[PDB]
């Protein structure tokens, strides 16, 4: 078993390097070795965990569109061997499960898993593997708008990654997290260099997904600066990048469509805003993303028919999904809309919701 | 909306 265990370690190394050809080679090698040794319950779980992690990489690089996804059968195979776990295998189990939960918008489960992984971090001698942990922990803290916690882990990650060679993908992703934390501190001019750096690296390694994401993150800065026409240009080109290189069905394209929709209404192009909102809504429904659909439903209910009962119900829903930053962003949109319309009694209510969300966020 | 963290 040490021989097969080394191979699975090698496999994981290539996954972290985003070298799909090597990962597939190692995957096929491991499966050949398994078919002969075939006598080790832990080695098999490590195998199923790496299968899991490998698919996570593939789903990020090529999103697959009726059939039970490969990720679900692997997750089932992995959740049957939870008793008597120990050592680094236990760290992997909780870390990989945390990653999966994060991809399903199961934020509380994800922190729960990550925190269990954190306890065994002194078991992880590999500095690059610890960087993976810190990067992924920083990411979820950013999505929870735990800015200081997020920066605390992200700096640890990027130093490790920047100390090695060929972790370019993760270095871009760390630049995303750093920049986005500055944006959450109201420093869009501090965020832009990080995203411009990422965009340049994303173009050098010709990774369309990261190119489209850099343009989106830049569009978010212009939006914050109220440079709405420039934000709109960034959002459109990012959408085009995604749509032209096989990511037209990536759930994360919905973020760019959402912000373009908001942007179009901010420029008072009412009809175009509805058009974008409806396209984003339809795609959300076709990608079976309930959470994204709700956000498109909110913007439409805000700018089109002023359905405040529906706005309130959506804000409550996102809070139950532990997505307080979106509660804050969406309540802020409604507050500012009703303020401009001089419906100040309604604007007050949404400002109170913005204040409530910020307090929930600060409560940690 | 949250930025892209990939």
Residue numbers in the entry:
A (entry chain A): 8 to 72, 75 to 373
B (entry chain C): 2 to 7
The authors write:
In addition to the 2 putative pheromones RRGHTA and SRGHTS, we included in the analysis an extended (RRGHTAS) and a shorter (RGHTS) version of the internal and C-terminal putative pheromones, respectively, that could represent alternative forms of their maturation. Only a 20% reduction in the affinity (EC50 = 6,70 nM) was observed for the possible maturation variant of the internal Phr3T pheromone (RRGHTAS) with an extra amino acid. To molecularly assess the differences in affinity and stabilization for the alternative peptides analyzed we solved the structures for Rap3T in complex with RRGHTAS, SRGHTS, and RGHTS. Meanwhile complexes with RRGHTAS and RGHTS peptides exhibited P21 space group and a Rap dimer in the asymmetric unit. Remarkably, these structures exhibited nearly identical conformations as confirmed by the low differences in the superimposition of their Cα atoms for either individual monomers or the complete dimers (RMSD 0.36–0.50), dispelling the notion of peptides eliciting divergent conformational shifts. Notice that the molecular conformational are due to peptide binding and not induced by the crystallization conditions since crystals were obtained in 2 different space groups and cell dimensions. Interestingly, the structure of the complex with RRGHTAS peptide showed that the additional Ser residue lacks electron density that prevented its building, supporting the idea that this residue does not participate in the binding and that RRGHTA is the genuine mature peptide version.
